[PDB]
């Protein structure tokens, strides 16, 4: 029974639970890697005495946090648990293929571990650019194991995208149009379309890297007429959609959380929120070269990519202002999930504004490959994603488990994390403006003060992560079972009780046309 249920699953809730457990474990790995980064930088000099190892830690930090923590939690965990419930569907369209999307991830993560254990690791950056990642500067198996890890994670997510698009298009009640589905469901559909289109381009690029390393191709090698910059275009043609894939489900969850704890039946400006996510999805394919402003790019191309990148703040702003308009007039409930969502709005706004600074290619010349970029994305993406994940985890933990958290402990956890992440990343703006490069294991002495503060911040967030594990333990240890949940008339995922039965919507909802 245990194997049938948990290794042979065809159930969207159990698969969602598997993804949440996997993603929480990966988040411990990715946090430990981030603390090694900050320990190496927390005083001047060398800590590891091996900067190849430092570079391997940085590279694996980003792959773990992106491919094994955020994407599995947002899309595999919250998407599988919540999407079918929010449309009244009995499961996903392809419930068995869904289980393979999950089970490809432990082997993908094993390949990434393997890459770091063999030879000297892949000390490449998560961009994996050649020729550093080629077979002369990274001879041996580490980079190929990293490529294969990415291939498996890509297949997992492409099949998952197929599943989500199909389920959301085909399995709603017959009377429910796409403009009657909740915003989280929209955010997953759009994320899935971005995955479907972008991950095959990454797969092509990393396969060309694999063949340059092992089959004597020269896609990226000038000796054969190849070009390192071609790899960067293929990588970033995926990688820009990827940053929106990482945040879009978070936007969906934030819309639900802000609406719920405002005591509202609906988000402000629903169609504008759909418009904004669709626009971000579409424009997310035409801006990638802003990751390449220093490669030797012609001025008119720089001007185009600057302008297209600026156009994206418009639909993103409709979403920030619409979250503020949802709060307006609300019966505000200061629950821990609401605190996470308000933290998200603040931090995402800070990070999006420093992205606007970066969009100007002339300023980006001076800021590229410095800690100002690291500060932009740890606000707008890394901590935007983590605060939306924690808001959604706190808000929906009683649905998934049937038990309540201790809200006082959850508010203490939020307070510690908010101090920690701001102490960690805010000073990195100053480091970047004053010229400290990213991807460095040590720094000229002038940069000591802000690196020291940033590293002390990183230990505050460690304390918060340890406390989060205790908080989850205390909830399962005390077994406070949920009774009543407010606002079920506009939050269908709760209407089957906590936790919902294994099969839900065996009799579908009744929705008429009128």
């Amino acid at each position: 029974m245990f194997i049938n249920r948990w290794l042979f699953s065809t159930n969207h809730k159990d698969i969602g639970t598997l993804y949440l457990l996997f993603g929480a474990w990966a988040g411990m790995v990715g946090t430990a890697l981030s603390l090694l980064i900050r320990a190496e930088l927390g005083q001047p000099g060398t800590l590891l005495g091996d900067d190849q190892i430092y570079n391997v830690v940085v590279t694996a930090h980003a792959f773990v946090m992106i491919f094994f923590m955020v994407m599995p939690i947002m899309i595999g965990g919250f998407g599988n648990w919540l999407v079918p419930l929010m449309i009244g569907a009995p499961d996903m369209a392809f419930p068995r293929m869904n289980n393979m999307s999950f089970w490809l991830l432990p082997p993908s993560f094993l390949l990434l571990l393997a890459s770091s254990m063999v030879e000297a690791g892949a000390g490449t950056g998560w961009t994996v650019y050649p020729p550093l990642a080629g077979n002369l500067a990274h001879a041996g198996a580490s980079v190929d194991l990293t490529i294969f890890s990415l291939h498996l994670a890509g297949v997992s997510s492409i099949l998952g995208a197929i599943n989500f698009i199909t389920t959301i298009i085909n399995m709603k009640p017959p009377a429910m149009s796409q403009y009657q589905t909740p915003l989280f469901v929209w955010s997953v559909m759009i994320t899935a379309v971005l995955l479907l289109l972008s991950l095959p381009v990454l797969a092509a690029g990393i396969t060309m890297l694999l063949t340059d390393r092992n089959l004597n191709t020269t896609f990226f090698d000038p000796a054969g007429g190849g070009d390192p910059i071609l790899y960067q275009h293929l990588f970033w043609f995926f990688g820009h959609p990827e940053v929106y894939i990482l945040i879009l489900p978070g936007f969906g969850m934030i819309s639900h959380i802000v609406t719920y704890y405002s005591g509202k039946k609906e988000p402000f400006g629903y169609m504008g929120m759909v418009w904004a996510m669709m626009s971000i999805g579409f424009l997310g394919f035409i801006v990638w070269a802003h990751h390449m402003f220093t490669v030797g790019m012609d001025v008119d191309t720089r001007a185009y990519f600057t302008s297209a990148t600026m156009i994206i703040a418009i639909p993103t702003g409709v979403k920030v202002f619409s979250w503020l308009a949802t709060l307006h007039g609300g019966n505000i409930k200061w629950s821990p999930a609401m605190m996470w969502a308000l933290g998200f709005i603040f931090l995402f706004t800070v990070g999006g504004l420093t992205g606007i600074v970066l969009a100007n290619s002339s300023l980006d010349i001076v800021l590229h490959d410095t800690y100002y970029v690291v500060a932009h994305f740890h606000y707008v993406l890394s901590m935007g994603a983590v605060f939306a994940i924690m808001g959604g985890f706190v808000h929906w933990f009683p649905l998934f488990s049937g038990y309540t958290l201790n809200d006082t402990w959850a508010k203490i956890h939020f307070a510690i994390m908010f101090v920690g992440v701001n102490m960690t990343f805010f000073p990195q703006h100053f480091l970047g403006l004053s010229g400290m490069p990213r991807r460095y294991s040590d720094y000229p002495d002038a940069y000591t003060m802000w690196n020291t503060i940033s590293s002390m911040g990183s230990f505050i967030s460690l304390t918060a992560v340890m406390l989060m594990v205790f908080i989850i333990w205390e909830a399962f240890a005390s077994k406070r079972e949920v009774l009543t949940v407010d606002l079920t008339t506009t939050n269908l995922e709760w209407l089957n009780g906590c936790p919902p039965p294994y099969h839900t919507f065996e009799e579908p909802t009744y929705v008429n046309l009128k």
């Binding site: 077979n135 092992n214 004597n216 000796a223 054969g224």
Partner: protein, 80 residues
């Protein structure tokens, strides 16, 4: 060109046997008529060709997967 009414099974069989397979037969003629080995060019050890940055994982490491001794020189030239 013409019919355009029903595109049914009978029309698609008519197109298969009346246009598609005759085309394949004509191109098969055209090909098996220009076939016949052509003189291999002087070997020149150009550096952008016969790339070897890592031995191939088969054979002696130095032969491509569908190596044809008649027309594929090694980095050192044609085989004897």
């Amino acid at each position: 060109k013409g019919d355009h009414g029903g595109t049914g099974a009978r029309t698609w069989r008519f197109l298969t046997f009346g246009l598609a397979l005759p085309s394949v037969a004509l191109c098969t003629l055209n090909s098996w008529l220009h076939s016949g080995h052509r003189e291999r060019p002087a070997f020149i050890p150009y550096h952008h060709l016969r790339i070897r940055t890592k031995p191939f994982s088969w054979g002696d490491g130095n032969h491509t997967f569908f190596h044809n001794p008649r027309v594929n020189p090694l980095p050192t030239g044609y085989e004897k």
